[PDB]
Amino acid sequence: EEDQAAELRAYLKSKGLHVDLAQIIEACDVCLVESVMNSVVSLLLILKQEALIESLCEKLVKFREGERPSLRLQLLSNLFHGMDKNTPVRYTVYCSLIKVAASCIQYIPTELDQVRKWISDWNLTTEKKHTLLRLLYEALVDCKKSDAASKVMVELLGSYTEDNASQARVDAHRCIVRALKDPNAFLFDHLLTLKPVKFLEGELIHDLLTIFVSAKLASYVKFYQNNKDFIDSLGLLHEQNMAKMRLLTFMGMAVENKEISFDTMQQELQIGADDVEAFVIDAVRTKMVYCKIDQTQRKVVVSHSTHRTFGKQQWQQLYDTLNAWKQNLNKVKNSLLSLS
Amino acid sequence: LYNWLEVEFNPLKLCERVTKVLNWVREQPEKEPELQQYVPQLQNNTILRLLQQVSQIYQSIEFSRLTSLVPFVDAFQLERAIVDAARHCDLQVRIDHTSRTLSFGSDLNYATREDAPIGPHLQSMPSEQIRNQLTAMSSVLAKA
Amino acid sequence: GRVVRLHPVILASIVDSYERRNEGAARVIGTLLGTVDKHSVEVTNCFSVPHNESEDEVAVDMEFAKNMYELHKKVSPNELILGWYATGHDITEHSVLIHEYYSREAPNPIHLTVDTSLQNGRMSIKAYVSTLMGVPGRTMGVMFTPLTVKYAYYDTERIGVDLIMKTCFSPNRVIGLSSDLQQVGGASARIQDALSTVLQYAEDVLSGKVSADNTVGRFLMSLVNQVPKIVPDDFETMLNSNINDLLMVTYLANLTQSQIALNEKLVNL
C-alpha cells in the first residue's frame, strides 16, 4: 500500500504517489538492506507501470559497472520473475537482466521456443528483435557457449530480408570467422541459405564457402597460393583450416565407395603411408563418419557417412527404402495383432 | 592420468603417453619408493584399455603391428593378457595366426554380458549394433 | 537451489488428496521430503494433512505435522524437508502465515503452486519460496520468489507410467492389464503411426515444402545411417538359429513341466 513508501521516504531522506514512487526510485541507488530494494518490488508491481519501471531499471543497469553488481542482479532476478503476464517494456527489464548476465550468468531461461514465445507475444517488430538477439549474441559468446551461439547467430542472420541485407555486412563477416575459428562447426550449408550471403560476393569470406561445401582440397590448395594475405588477415590460421578440408574431401569420398582402399588418401589428401591411422580416428571421434579399418587386407570399410548438400536424388533414396519398410511393417502389424 | 586412461578415446596414443608417466615412476625408486609396488599393475590395465579402444574402430589388424605398438612386454606375455579380457569382461578380440591377423568384432552370434567396462567410448562393434537396432527406429522417429 | 526436480508421484497424490476433502475448504497443507545438490532440488514423496479453515485463521496441527515426518522417517532416514505445497494459483492471507511456520524449523521452504484448473488454461504449476528481511515498524510487505519446477523420470517409472499413460486413449478410462505380444504388435502400431508422420511430410518435402529443409534433412539421413549393413546371409545364421534356441526352450520347459505334471499324476495317488 501507500504507507510503505512513506517510511521509505523516511529511510532515504535520512540516509542520503507514482511520482512519489519514482522519487523514491531517485533516492536510493544514488546512495547505494535487501527489503529496501524488495519492498520497492512490493511497491512497483502492485499499481501505470511504464514510467516508474523505466526510471528504475535505468538506475539498476548503471550499477553493474560499479563495485558490487550482485545485489542489483539478485533483485532484478526477483523482478524479472515477477511480471510474467505481458509487457513490451519487459524487454527493457530483461535488457538489464542480460546486461547483468554478461557482466558476471546462466540461471536465466534462454530456450528457443521460449524466446519466440517472448518475441511473438511481446509482438514487437524485427528491429527490437534485432537488438534483443544481438544482446543475446555477445552475452552468449562471452560465457563459452559456442554451439548455442550459432543458433542465435543464424536467427540473427535469418531475421533479415532482401531489403535490409545492405546493413548485414559486419556480422556476415563475423559469423563465419568466429565459426572458422571453431574446428567443430561442421555445417556450412546453413551459412549459405541466408538472404544477405547470396547478395554478397567478391573477396569476402563467403567465397571460401563454395570452396568448402561442394568443392574439395584441389580447389583450396590453389587458393593458398593466391592469397597469403587475406585468409591470414582476419581471425584465421591456415593449418586448422587444412584439417577441416582434409575431412571434407575424405568424408565426401566416404559417402561414395564404402569399399575404399588406403592409397586414395595418400593421393587425394597428400600425406604419406603411416599418417592415415591416427587421422581415421579424428574422423570417427567427432560424429561425422563412423569408419573402420580392415588394416590387414588394406581396406577402409565404413559404416555410414554424412552429406554436405542434398538433392532430389537424396530424398529419393529415403523414399523407396522407407516405403517398403512401411510395407514390410504393414505385414507384421497385420500378423502380430491377429494372434490375440 | 584420468585424462588418458579413463576418459579419452585415443587408441594409438595410450601406449606411448601413459608409459611416459610410468617411466617417471621408474626414474626414482630411491627418492619416492612408495609408488613402486604399482609399477606392473597399471600395465595390466594398459593392454586391455587399448584393446577396449582399438576394437571399437578396427576390424582387422596384424599381430605384428601390435607387438611394435606396446614396447614394454614380449609377445607371449602379451598374448595371454589378450585372451582373458576377451573370454571374460566382454571384449571382441579374435586371433588368426595363418595370416597373423587379429579380428575385432566380426562374430554376429554374440550375446553381450552386463559386467563390461563402458569406458572411453565410440560406436561399438556390430554385435552390440545388430542387437538394439529396433530401438534406433523407435528413438529417432519420435524425435522426428 | 534454483531448479526444482519434482517427480510425478507427487502430482496424482495431490489430486487423489484433492478429490477426498473436507467439504468447502480450498487447500491441503502438507510437507514434502527429498534431496538437494544446490542447483537441483529433488522432492520424492508426499502425504495429505488436514487443517481447520476459518476467517484469517488456518490452524495447522503442529503435533500432526511433525508426526508424518517421523512416520516416514521410519521408512528412510535419508530425506530432508524441502517444502510444502498449497493448491490454487490464488494466494489469500492464509498462505503467507503458514510459510513462516516452517522457517522456524528452518529450511528455505520450497513451495509449489498447484491448480485445480485455469479456466481457459491448463494445470500451470510453479515453484515458490519465501525469503525476505525487515524494516522494524511495518515489515509487512512480502512477495514470493518463484523458481522453475521440472519433473524427472526413472527407467522403471518411465516404463511404468506408459501403461498409466494409456488411460487417456480409452472411453471410460479402463485398459485391462495387457498381454506381451499384443504389446509387441502395438509397438509395430507405435511404429506405424510414427512412420506416417515423416512419410506424409516426405511427399510434401519432395515436391514443394523445402523452406526449412535441412533440419529435417539432417535427421532423416542420420536415421537411415545409424542402422548398420549386413547382406542377409549373415542375418539368418543369427536369426533362425536364435529361433532354434527359443523354440528349444519352448520344448524343454514343456519337457520339464509335463514331467512335473506326470510326477504330479504319480504323487497324487
UniProtKB/Swiss-Prot annotation, chain A:
Expression sites by tissue: Broadly expressed.
Q: Which effect does the record note for changing residue 322 to P?
A: Reduces HSV binding and entry
Impact of altering residue 50 to G? In a breast cancer sample; somatic mutation
Residues annotated as region Interaction with HSV-1 and HSV-2?
312-340
List residues of the PCI domain.
148-307
* Residue positions where N6-acetyllysine is found in the record: 222
Q: Which residues carry this modification: Phosphoserine?
A: 120, 335
**What does this protein's UniProt record list under function?**
Component of the eukaryotic translation initiation factor 3 (eIF-3) complex, which is required for several steps in the initiation of protein synthesis. The eIF-3 complex associates with the 40S ribosome and facilitates the recruitment of eIF-1, eIF-1A, eIF-2:GTP:methionyl-tRNAi and eIF-5 to form the 43S pre-initiation complex (43S PIC). The eIF-3 complex stimulates mRNA recruitment to the 43S PIC and scanning of the mRNA for AUG recognition.
Q: Which PANTHER family match?
A: COP9 SIGNALOSOME COMPLEX SUBUNIT 7/DENDRITIC CELL PROTEIN GA17, EUKARYOTIC TRANSLATION INITIATION FACTOR 3 SUBUNIT M
Which protein is depicted?
Answer: Eukaryotic translation initiation factor 3 subunit M
- What's the gene? EIF3M
From Swiss-Prot, chain B:
- Modified sites of kind Phosphoserine: 103
What are the transmembrane regions? none
Q: Where in the cell is it found?
A: Cytoplasm
Q: How is it modified after translation?
A: Phosphorylated. Phosphorylation is enhanced upon serum stimulation.
Subunit and partners:
Interacts with EIF4G1. Component of the eukaryotic translation initiation factor 3 (eIF-3) complex, which is composed of 13 subunits: EIF3A, EIF3B, EIF3C, EIF3D, EIF3E, EIF3F, EIF3G, EIF3H, EIF3I, EIF3J, EIF3K, EIF3L and EIF3M. The eIF-3 complex appears to include 3 stable modules: module A is composed of EIF3A, EIF3B, EIF3G and EIF3I; module B is composed of EIF3F, EIF3H, and EIF3M; and module C is composed of EIF3C, EIF3D, EIF3E, EIF3L and EIF3K. EIF3C of module C binds EIF3B of module A and EIF3H of module B, thereby linking the three modules.
Biological role stated in the UniProt entry:
RNA-binding component of the eukaryotic translation initiation factor 3 (eIF-3) complex, which is required for several steps in the initiation of protein synthesis. The eIF-3 complex associates with the 40S ribosome and facilitates the recruitment of eIF-1, eIF-1A, eIF-2:GTP:methionyl-tRNAi and eIF-5 to form the 43S pre-initiation complex (43S PIC). The eIF-3 complex stimulates mRNA recruitment to the 43S PIC and scanning of the mRNA for AUG recognition.
* Membership in a protein family: Belongs to the eIF-3 subunit A family.
Protein's recorded name: Eukaryotic translation initiation factor 3 subunit A
Species: Homo sapiens (Human)
The residues of the intact protein that this chain contains are 390 to 533 of 1382
Swiss-Prot record, chain C:
Residues annotated with N6-acetyllysine modification: 150
The GO annotation for biological process reads: formation of cytoplasmic translation initiation complex; IRES-dependent viral translational initiation; proteolysis; translational initiation
Source domain of life: Eukaryota
Summarize the PTM comment: Phosphorylation is enhanced upon serum stimulation. Phosphorylated during apoptosis by caspase-processed CDK11.
As its record notes, the protein acts as a catalyst of:
Thiol-dependent hydrolysis of ester, thioester, amide, peptide and isopeptide bonds formed by the C-terminal Gly of ubiquitin (a 76-residue protein attached to proteins as an intracellular targeting signal)
Q: Which UniProt keywords apply?
A: Acetylation, Cytoplasm, Disease variant, Hydrolase, Initiation factor, Intellectual disability, Phosphoprotein, Protease, Protein biosynthesis, Thiol protease, Ubl conjugation pathway
The answer to whether the entry has keyword rRNA-binding is no
NADP found in the keyword field: no
Tell me which EC number(s) this protein carries: 3.4.19.12
Q: Where is the MPN domain?
A: 4-134
- Subunit field text: Component of the eukaryotic translation initiation factor 3 (eIF-3) complex, which is composed of 13 subunits: EIF3A, EIF3B, EIF3C, EIF3D, EIF3E, EIF3F, EIF3G, EIF3H, EIF3I, EIF3J, EIF3K, EIF3L and EIF3M. The eIF-3 complex appears to include 3 stable modules: module A is composed of EIF3A, EIF3B, EIF3G and EIF3I; module B is composed of EIF3F, EIF3H, and EIF3M; and module C is composed of EIF3C, EIF3D, EIF3E, EIF3K and EIF3L. EIF3C of module C binds EIF3B of module A and EIF3H of module B, thereby linking the three modules. EIF3J is a labile subunit that binds to the eIF-3 complex via EIF3B.
For this chain, the family text in UniProt reads:
Belongs to the eIF-3 subunit F family.
Associated condition reads:
Intellectual developmental disorder, autosomal recessive 67: A form of intellectual disability, a disorder characterized by significantly below average general intellectual functioning associated with impairments in adaptive behavior and manifested during the developmental period. Some MRT67 patients manifest seizures and sensorineural hearing loss.
